[PDB]
Amino acid sequence: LHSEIGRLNNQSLLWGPYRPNIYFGTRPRIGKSLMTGLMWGKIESYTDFQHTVRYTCEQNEGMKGYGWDEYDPRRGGIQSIHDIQNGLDITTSFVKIPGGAHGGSWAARIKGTLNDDAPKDQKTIVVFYVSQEGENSELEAVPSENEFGYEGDVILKGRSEALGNYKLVVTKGKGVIPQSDHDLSRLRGPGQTVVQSLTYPDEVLWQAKPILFQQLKAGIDWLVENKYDVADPPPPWQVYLLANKPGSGNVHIVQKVFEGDFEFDILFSSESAGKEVTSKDLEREVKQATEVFGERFARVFDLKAPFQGDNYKKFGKSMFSNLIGGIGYFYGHSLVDRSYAPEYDEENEGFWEDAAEARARHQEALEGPYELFTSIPSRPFFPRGFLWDEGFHLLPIADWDIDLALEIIKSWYNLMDEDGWIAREQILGAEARSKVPKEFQTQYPHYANPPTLFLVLDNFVERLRKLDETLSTASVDNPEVGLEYLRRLYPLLRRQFDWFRKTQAGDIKSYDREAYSTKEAYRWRGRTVSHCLTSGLDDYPRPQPPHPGELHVDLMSWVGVMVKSLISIGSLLGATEDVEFYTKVLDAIEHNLDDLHWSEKEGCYCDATIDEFEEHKLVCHKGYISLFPFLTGLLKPDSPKLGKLLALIGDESELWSPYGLRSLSKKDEFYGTAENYWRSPVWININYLAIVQLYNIATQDGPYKETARDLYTRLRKNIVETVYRNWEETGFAWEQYNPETGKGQRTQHFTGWTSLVVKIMSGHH
Numbered sequence: 001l002h003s004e005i006g007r008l009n010n011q012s013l014l015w016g017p018y019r020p021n022i023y024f025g026t027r028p029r030i031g032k033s034l035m036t037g038l039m040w041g042k043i044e045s046y047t048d049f050q051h052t053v054r055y056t057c058e059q060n061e062g063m064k065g066y067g068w069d070e071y072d073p074r075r076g077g078i079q080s081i082h083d084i085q086n087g088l089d090i091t092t093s094f095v096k097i098p099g100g101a102h103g104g105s106w107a108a109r110i111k112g113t114l115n116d117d118a119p120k121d122q123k124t125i126v127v128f129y130v131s132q133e134g135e136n137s138e139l140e141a142v143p144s145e146n147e148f149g150y151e152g153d154v155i156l157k158g159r160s161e162a163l164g165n166y167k168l169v170v171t172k173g174k175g176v177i178p179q180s181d182h183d184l185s186r187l188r189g190p191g192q193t194v195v196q197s198l199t200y201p202d203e204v205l206w207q208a209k210p211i212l213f214q215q216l217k218a219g220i221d222w223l224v225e226n227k228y229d230v231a232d233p234p235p236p237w238q239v240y241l242l243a244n245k246p247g248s249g250n251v252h253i254v255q256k257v258f259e260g261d262f263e264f265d266i267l268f269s270s271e272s273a274g275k276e277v278t279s280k281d282l283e284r285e286v287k288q289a290t291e292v293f294g295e296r297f298a299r300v301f302d303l304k305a306p307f308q309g310d311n312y313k314k315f316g317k318s319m320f321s322n323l324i325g326g327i328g329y330f331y332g333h334s335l336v337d338r339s340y341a342p343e344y345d346e347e348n349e350g351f352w353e354d355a356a357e358a359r360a361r362h363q364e365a366l367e368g369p370y371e372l373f374t375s376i377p378s379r380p381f382f383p384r385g386f387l388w389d390e391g392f393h394l395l396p397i398a399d400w401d402i403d404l405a406l407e408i409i410k411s412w413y414n415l416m417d418e419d420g421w422i423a424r425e426q427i428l429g430a431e432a433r434s435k436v437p438k439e440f441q442t443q444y445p446h447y448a449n450p451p452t453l454f455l456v457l458d459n460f461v462e463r464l465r466k467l468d469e470t471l472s473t474a475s476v477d478n479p480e481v482g483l484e485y486l487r488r489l490y491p492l493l494r495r496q497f498d499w500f501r502k503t504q505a506g507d508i509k510s511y512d513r514e515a516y517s518t519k520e521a522y523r524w525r526g527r528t529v530s531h532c533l534t535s536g537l538d539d540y541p542r543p544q545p546p547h548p549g550e551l552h553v554d555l556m557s558w559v560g561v562m563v564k565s566l567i568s569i570g571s572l573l574g575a576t577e578d579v580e581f582y583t584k585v586l587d588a589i590e591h592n593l594d595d596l597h598w599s600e601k602e603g604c605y606c607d608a609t610i611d612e613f614e615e616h617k618l619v620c621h622k623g624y625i626s627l628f629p630f631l632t633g634l635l636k637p638d639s640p641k642l643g644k645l646l647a648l649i650g651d652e653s654e655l656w657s658p659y660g661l662r663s664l665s666k667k668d669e670f671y672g673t674a675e676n677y678w679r680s681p682v683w684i685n686i687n688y689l690a691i692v693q694l695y696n697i698a699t700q701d702g703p704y705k706e707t708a709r710d711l712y713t714r715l716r717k718n719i720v721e722t723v724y725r726n727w728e729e730t731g732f733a734w735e736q737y738n739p740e741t742g743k744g745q746r747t748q749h750f751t752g753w754t755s756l757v758v759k760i761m762s763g764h765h
């Protein structure tokens with residue numbers, strides 16, 4: 001029956017606009033198949049379109065905002081794009097229509113509206129781009145009655161083993177299409193819809209902008225050869241109208257030119273389903289999709305006070321729709337250094353100079369292809385899977401659709417190599433690689449990243465203990481199905497757990513170090529003089545210099561998190577032998593945290609090194625790191641050290657700001673130095689952990705219950721209001737928030753773990 005549930009889920013999630021790297025596009029969860037893309041641009045001159053055309057996501061003075069107003073990957077949603085440069089407001093309404101054997105049909109409306117600044121008579125070029133990969137696939141534009149192009153709809157008929165038979169339709173549209181008086185119209189027509197059907201090698205079909213421009217440039221080359229000059233030139237909009245040449249090929253370019261406002265429709269009809277999809281079906285399904293989204297939002301995200309307001313509800317829907325709407329399907333090769341050079345063992349003083357020289361050997365090579373279905377941090381600046389980010393992204397997604405979060409987890413853990421490594425940053429295919437300098441594409445099998453996905457699994461295990469609607473919860477409703485899901489994954493978690501202990505181990509036995517266990521102590525590989533990228537916390541200050549004696553308290557605590565999950569899932573599958581080993585190991589870590597990482601002098605957990613004179617030294621930099629055993633739920637609620645931590649958390653002169661908890665204390669010598677990435681700013685992901693843990697303490701008989709209840713109440717309020725104010729003010733979620741001004745700084749459109757904010761508002765953790 002787990003198979004039957006599994007089969008239905010594949011067929012439900014197959015189609016989406018899973019191309020979050022572009023403003024709007026579709027692809028299914030198949031690596032070589034059919035993809036679509038939207039391009040638009042105002043045309044006012046003979047050179048301007050190349051600077052105005054839109055395709056891949058950006059954020060500059062020219063673009064006010066864009067994002068999803070409503071989205072569910074099972075049903076679809078609506079996207080708004082506010083384009084200053086092109087003087088346009090754009091709506092992309094996408095909806096999925098179940099039926100047949102090939103993962104349903106779908107449709108999309110594209111509404112353009114001129115804004116008040118735009119000339120009322122602006123010429124807007126719009127393109128719909130369509131490509132197919134496969135050796136056994138075919139696709140063909142049915143030609144037009146009329147001479148020079150289309151007065152009606154454009155029909156593409158295609159076939160593939162993957163999708164069966166299909167018609168994909170680009171309707172005529174509402175909108176004035178401009179007419180050219182020029183002589184060129186005797187030969188090109190006065191202005192109409194046109195199609196070019198081309199063929200290119202399968203590996204370059206993604207490069208839609210250059211493919212388009214080569215055709216534009218060829219049209220222009222043809223004007224010059226045929227004596228159309230500056231003596232009496234045709235209008236710019238007719239110069240950039242392609243010559244109609246429909247047929248068969250693996251690329252199809254559909255081009256329209258509109259004067260003023262416009263809309264038009266894309267109807268994809270699975271032959272294997274009922275009768276074809278109509279524009280009437282698109283309207284109906286859109287209305288139906290809003291009503292489901294509305295009803296679910298209120299059920300799953302019941303905003304508790306003081307955020308019960310409709311302003312806070314519209315803010316909640318925007319943060320959530322953009323988190324889940326940024327889900328992508330990725331396919332291609334990855335750049336990995338598989339040398340396993342001995343220098344990457346970092347067993348030497350000055351280990352960073354050695355590993356630099358091994359990277360300079362450039363042994364890395366493409367490997368795969370790999371496939372990933374993930375939510376992303378940033379549509380415009382880094383639209384790709386980041387390992388520990390996803391553990392934060394899936395916390396709210398898992399509320400909305402626990403079956404969907406488990407499909408993403410499975411997607412991530414199917415990347416694991418024989419050793420138990422998952423690369424922390426997934427750059428799949430050339431489309432991905434085009435948005436990344438060569439130097440930063442290469443992944444390293446000794447670089448780790450916080451095991452945040454265990455948290456999402458912890459939430460699953462609680463629920464399991466205690467048709468779109470039916471499927472969304474099928475893994476908790478059908479307990480047989482849940483345990484079977486775990487039975488298969490569990491091995492992989494256990495491998496990853498063992499990987500951490502082999503590769504990220506620190507040294508006890510070779511130094512003057514007493515402690516309860518000689519086994520347990522951990523050190524992040526990959527750290528440079530001023531960084532530790534693998535920890536998640538780029539420039540949080542660490543012992544100087546970096547050293548092979550180093551122990552990192554935040555890593556040990558992440559191991560804490562896994563053992564507790566393995567203890568938990570292990571218990572459920574009755575792996576008696578296994579749970580007993582973890583039970584030993586959890587006891588050990590608890591003692592060793594204190595024995596190696598606790599400071600009575602500073603009153604908090606610290607990182608460690610060894611001295612100039614070969615003694616163990618604690619190095620204390622009050623901030624996120626200092627709290628880590630608290631943030632990970634490892635301390636007993638009656639603990640005196642926890643009490644000491646609640647004091648530092650509350651303390652205005654250190655971490656506590658009006659806008660949330662500072663990453664680093666105002667008292668620390670590195671407060672607000674260098675790039676200041678994790679050296680003062682407030683990060684929603686770490687705050688979310690502190691909030692969820694305070695709340696646990698505050699809802700339990702015990703010594704700090706009341707102190708907890710107070711800090712939870714204010715922290716919740718400060719974080720939600722700081723995100724909400726900046727959303728009202730700017731329309732954006734920000735990477736981080738400034739602890740002095742409360743302004744969002746660094747990257748816009750971070751949805752992104754800043755969207756955890758909706759789970760904070762719904763409470764009842």
Ligand SMILES: O=[N+]([O-])c1cc(-c2ncccn2)ccc1NCCCCCCN1C[C@H](O)[C@@H](O)[C@H](O)[C@H]1CO
Pocket residue numbers: 377380381382386388389536537538746747
């Ligand atoms: O290159 N480009 O595209 C860019 C552009 C930019 C601009 N531009 C313009 C205007 C503004 N800004 C930025 C920037 C960038 N990049 C860069 C990459 C990398 C990123 C990462 C993040 N993070 C971090 C943290 O720590 C961690 O934790 C996590 O994990 C991650 C994930 O989320």
